[model samples]
Target: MVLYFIGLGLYDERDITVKGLEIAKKCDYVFAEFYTSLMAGTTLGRIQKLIGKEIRVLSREDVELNFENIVLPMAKENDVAFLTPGDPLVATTHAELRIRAKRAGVESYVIHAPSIYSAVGITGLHIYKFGKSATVAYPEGNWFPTSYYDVIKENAERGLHTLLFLDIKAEKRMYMTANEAMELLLKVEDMKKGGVFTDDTLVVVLARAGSLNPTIRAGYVKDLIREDFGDPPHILIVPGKLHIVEAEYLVEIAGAPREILRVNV
Candidate 1:
């Protein structure tokens, strides 16, 4: 018996790879976990219809609370498939689960798929040029944290692009827009005199990748805060250093201001 941890990719039911589709069809039981990320507007009913399989959806508490008793036992008994929204290993919790399953002497297999983290390459930025990723949370009162700023600052100093993942709450159907994420970044700039990000800093905003209405735009932080990026599941990128071709690509493809992009000395 093998525990197949499958990645359903970024958007809808059709995003699953052929191998993942095969495993999903043949598996004795299929369970989906949606806490780490969402499947855009794709619902379980639609997915079940597309794949022609009944899927049991698991909540955050279900996986966290019944890990040993339910999840592991199922894996040990039958060929169980656990579906995740994005790439399975992207979330630390899922990685930890694999480790636990290994300890319990259960074999585990991962089916790789697309995640927002790797999808940034579509912006024409080098994948190796990115540094540690960060997330922006909902502001509480008037308080905001600048720790992510410091991480981006350090990465920028080394000429690495900073990938900023925005937050989302699928249960409530709430998603943080790119403009809202930019607003948070602007607040961090005001709090930290770290010289990491500024009003002139070139930022890339991506909304609803792998969807029909996907949007990609580039501009200064201040300008981005005002730009209307419709809907949710958005991500931001702050570039550290720009090559000539990369700069041209941003302006040509993403509508980045040519005047704001600066080459690294």
Candidate 2:
């Protein structure tokens, strides 16, 4: 009769909001998908133990191709909960799931939680300065992607920061690190000759967000591209024009070079 879209938050099972946890406990059926983001601090068993419910993990295919046949059918009769990493609606495709629910005559509600979109504040950059966000996808076979490079160019031209989400293949346990993303961007710059994403470009890497002592480092690509940030689930940021305070925060809090305080301005 009702469907709830609950966010598992960023890192662990405990990251879920108290309200989300309580509501999930009362759910008759709980379904979750982890492909959107990595839950590096927790496991499926741990989540089940905390929710006191058996969670059926859904594949991207199952959710995207067969939601109506699989999850929606149960929602028609029972209280169904759909869990996702970060905020449920933050994913572009997840919002369409609600449209499906409405079309199927199932009432749906969203439960909010912490998202990387907001957790980026820990980088000491103003959230409002962030422009279009793009995902860095692996180029397979003969196909190549350079759109993310263009995104950075466009954002920089407008003096807005660009957030680059690294790709992840959860089933294969593959995560693209910030180093790999920077390398790819350099290759794209070599091809496009856009003067964007050069080795000298300043960048920020935020790894294992939503955890205690997460890695926050900022420096030029030439110096830090190969630096080990530890673990998977890394995000890259190419900031545009910097505020004096923002530059200071990156220098002191994120370990960016002091030269940026003068150079970036």
lDDT of the structure predicted as candidate 2: 0.93
Q: Tell me model 1's lDDT, rounded to 2 decimals.
A: 0.81
TM-score against truth, every candidate: 0.93, 0.98
Q: What 10-residue stretch in candidate 1 is worst by lDDT?
A: 256-265
lDDT of 1 at 200: 77
Report, for all candidates in order, the number of backbone clashes.
Answer: 0, 0
lDDT of 2 by residue, 1-265 (tens): 8999999988889999999999999999999999988988999999999999999999999999998888889988799999998898874489999999899999999999999999999999999999999999999899888899989999999999999989988888899999999999999999999899898999999999988889999999999988999997899999999999999999999999999999444
What local lDDT does model 2 show for residue 10? 83
What is the overall TM-score of model 2 with all chains considered together?
0.98
Q: Kindly report which residue stretches of model 2 are placed more than 4 angstroms away from their true locations once superposed.
A: 263-265
Backbone clash pairs for candidate 2 read none
